[PDB]
Design a protein around this ligand. Sequence first.
Ligand SMILES: *[C@@H]1O[C@H](CO[C@@H]2O[C@@H](C)[C@@H](O)[C@@H](O)[C@@H]2O)[C@@H](O[C@@H]2O[C@H](CO)[C@@H](O)[C@H](O)[C@H]2NC(C)=O)[C@H](O)[C@H]1NC(C)=O
Ligand SMILES: *[C@@H]1O[C@H](CO[C@@H]2O[C@@H](C)[C@@H](O)[C@@H](O)[C@@H]2O)[C@@H](O[C@@H]2O[C@H](CO)[C@@H](O)[C@H](O)[C@H]2NC(C)=O)[C@H](O)[C@H]1NC(C)=O
Ligand SMILES: *[C@@H]1O[C@H](CO[C@@H]2O[C@@H](C)[C@@H](O)[C@@H](O)[C@@H]2O)[C@@H](O[C@@H]2O[C@H](CO)[C@@H](O)[C@H](O)[C@H]2NC(C)=O)[C@H](O)[C@H]1NC(C)=O
Ligand SMILES: CCCCN(CCc1c[nH]c2cc(O)ccc12)CCC1CCCCCC1
Ligand SMILES: *[C@@H]1O[C@H](CO[C@@H]2O[C@@H](C)[C@@H](O)[C@@H](O)[C@@H]2O)[C@@H](O)[C@H](O)[C@H]1NC(C)=O
Ligand SMILES: *[C@@H]1O[C@H](CO[C@@H]2O[C@@H](C)[C@@H](O)[C@@H](O)[C@@H]2O)[C@@H](O)[C@H](O)[C@H]1NC(C)=O
Ligand SMILES: CC(=O)N[C@H]1[C@H]([C@H](O)[C@H](O)CO)O[C@@](O)(C(=O)O)C[C@@H]1O
Ligand SMILES: *[C@@H]1O[C@H](CO)[C@@H](O)[C@H](O)[C@H]1NC(C)=O
Length: 526
Amino acid sequence: IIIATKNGKVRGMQLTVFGGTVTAFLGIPYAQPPLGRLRFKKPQSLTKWSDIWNATKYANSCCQNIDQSFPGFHGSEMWNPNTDLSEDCLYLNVWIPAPKPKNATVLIWIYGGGFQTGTSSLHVYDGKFLARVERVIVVSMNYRVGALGFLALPGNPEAPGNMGLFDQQLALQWVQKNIAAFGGNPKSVTLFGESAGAASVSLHLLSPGSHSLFTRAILQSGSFNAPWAVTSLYEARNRTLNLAKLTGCSRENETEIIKCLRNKDPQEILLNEAFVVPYGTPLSVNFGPTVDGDFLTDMPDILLELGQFKKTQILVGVNKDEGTAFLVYGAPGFSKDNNSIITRKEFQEGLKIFFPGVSEFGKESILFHYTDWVDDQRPENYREALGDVVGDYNFICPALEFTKKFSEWGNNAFFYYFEHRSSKLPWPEWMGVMHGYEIEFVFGLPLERRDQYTKAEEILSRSIVKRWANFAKYGNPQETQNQSTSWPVFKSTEQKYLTLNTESTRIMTKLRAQQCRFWTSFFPKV
Ligand SMILES: *[C@@H]1O[C@H](CO[C@@H]2O[C@@H](C)[C@@H](O)[C@@H](O)[C@@H]2O)[C@@H](O[C@@H]2O[C@H](CO)[C@@H](O)[C@H](O)[C@H]2NC(C)=O)[C@H](O)[C@H]1NC(C)=O
Ligand SMILES: *[C@@H]1O[C@H](CO[C@@H]2O[C@@H](C)[C@@H](O)[C@@H](O)[C@@H]2O)[C@@H](O[C@@H]2O[C@H](CO)[C@@H](O)[C@H](O)[C@H]2NC(C)=O)[C@H](O)[C@H]1NC(C)=O
Ligand SMILES: *[C@@H]1O[C@H](CO[C@@H]2O[C@@H](C)[C@@H](O)[C@@H](O)[C@@H]2O)[C@@H](O[C@@H]2O[C@H](CO)[C@@H](O)[C@H](O)[C@H]2NC(C)=O)[C@H](O)[C@H]1NC(C)=O
Ligand SMILES: CCCCN(CCc1c[nH]c2cc(O)ccc12)CCC1CCCCCC1
Ligand SMILES: *[C@@H]1O[C@H](CO[C@@H]2O[C@@H](C)[C@@H](O)[C@@H](O)[C@@H]2O)[C@@H](O)[C@H](O)[C@H]1NC(C)=O
Ligand SMILES: *[C@@H]1O[C@H](CO[C@@H]2O[C@@H](C)[C@@H](O)[C@@H](O)[C@@H]2O)[C@@H](O)[C@H](O)[C@H]1NC(C)=O
Ligand SMILES: CC(=O)N[C@H]1[C@H]([C@H](O)[C@H](O)CO)O[C@@](O)(C(=O)O)C[C@@H]1O
Ligand SMILES: *[C@@H]1O[C@H](CO)[C@@H](O)[C@H](O)[C@H]1NC(C)=O
């Protein structure tokens, strides 16, 4: 029940899972609380304790704005924090199999939420099923988001940028120094994450300070080359100065600006985050990763292109309808409570919401590439086109381009296309296989027979859980026993990928080839 770590003793709790037992340590601190003079700085190392730390409940979630667009709707609210918000939020969780394993592979989860939201305590990130079923150890951590996690004045240690990424890194360090005491193998650590969590994972593959802290990496619906994932040196500064003006903290000594922002309540910083950009989108990452000269040494597109990253296996993938979820947070004519049949004029209006600073010619060129109908009378034509536009530009094409470029330097890569709509999904049917709704299958929630999922979904989750676990243990995401479809490596020539669904697993080639040539090779010139 009690494990001695390098900083002190922690006490866990016993969980009953599938007629078996998992030991959970919820809320182990891994850094000095970033409070007071520590706000905005890199995370500081934690001093020893002599008592027994009780890690039996999830800790505080990091300060963040909350989705209030659909009060009382489980579809949006399941992503809102489920513990108190506090700047005192640098804690992590460990699920170990019972009985204590001897040398278990470790899976470290990094949540998404656009670098502005998210928390490790969410129900769909419960690691107890992976521990029970595959005998891996699951670790997840809270990291700072929003301006408190990524405010940037490059070079200035009072606010150097990328603090949230350094939080994640200090947690990976904790796993290296401490996980053997829990039965884990620090030499067999697989990072996995979704959305901004996946972008984070892709940046740890790029940061030299993370290279000895993990073995392999899994990227679900995200990567650093997505247009939302990296704030520019220019933008970050305009945004830092705009936040200072909004809080009455405009000063000339840049350090006295930070000092002034350190006497503001967290609530005042959160209220003004939305407005630092003149035109935002539903996908807007107001404060995100930057080229800080510490975590990130050069612009990441250049490092990817020139082979400057950790050489290892990656598992990458995306969902069939990445884009649809964002259409009901601003696009005109849309609603989760009707079928959202939009006109051509509403389509064009929607491009202005999602591409606010793009030229007229650029928006016409999107319209031209996505409105060459196979049938011009289908009334859902424009509704589906805008979802595909948003998903292809923001997620699917950047992930495919990351996988091609990474694989060109000789490592095995595996690419999946998730296309199952959860039978319990509370969003309407027109949004399809939504952004974020593979996560519960990865974490094995359908394996609980009590949870109203179908048995076909139990089989799909069971197979995904095995493939993920085999990837982390052996570099190879196969299911070798139940006559499953073999997952081939993704090579830059043939570009084979595997489809994940309840009907038939299939091998296909060159996903969204025609679409991604537009986004990756033409649209960057506009
Ligand atoms: C626990 O296992 C490690 C080996 O981990 C494996 O090898 C990694 C390279 C990676 O592929 C993981 O996914 C694997 O599971 C043992 O490491 C050995 O330690 C001895 C120390 O005497 C060293 O001489 C060997 O070179 C190491 N082997 C490798 C392959 O690096 C470790 O000893 C095991 N510890 C316990 C307590 O079981
Ligand atoms: C860079 O910053 C300036 C300043 O932004 C303004 O102040 C902030 C506190 C915030 O409330 C913003 O929404 C404000 O607009 C931006 O300049 C503004 O641009 C808008 C339209 O682009 C214009 O209507 C305002 O009058 C401008 N205000 C000032 C003081 O210049 C600017 O657009 C930002 N971005 C770029 C790329 O320059
Ligand atoms: C689908 O609904 C949108 C959103 O309208 C709101 O939500 C509905 C479910 C309903 O309760 C409405 O009363 C709400 O206002 C509709 O878009 C609106 O259309 C009106 C024209 O009647 C327009 O003035 C508003 O600006 C629109 N609102 C937005 C956010 O675009 C849309 O017409 C509905 N489409 C279908 C096919 O039913
Ligand atoms: C201005 C409105 C922002 C609302 N947002 C929430 C915060 C956010 C901003 N930008 C992002 C980018 C991402 O990849 C993921 C989340 C976010 C989208 C909410 C969705 C969560 C993810 C799964 C779909 C269901 C609703
Ligand atoms: C830490 O926890 C200690 C033991 O917890 C108690 O015993 C177990 C079996 C559970 O039933 C649990 O709910 C009980 O509370 C406490 O004795 C100790 O006071 C705790 N320390 C602090 C600082 O709260
Ligand atoms: C594999 O299947 C198990 C149950 O299926 C039975 O066993 C296999 C080996 C075949 O003989 C089949 O005809 C039987 O019905 C599941 O319990 C197990 O979880 C499955 N494993 C994975 C990774 O999906
Ligand atoms: C506010 C509102 O009218 N909600 C309606 C919901 C949602 O619109 C969808 O589940 C998508 O969110 O759909 C129902 O058909 C349903 O699922 O039983 C009935 C209900 O009236
Ligand atoms: C800004 O203030 C800090 C703290 O008082 C001081 O160390 C620094 O030298 C000042 N810089 C300038 C340019 O005034």
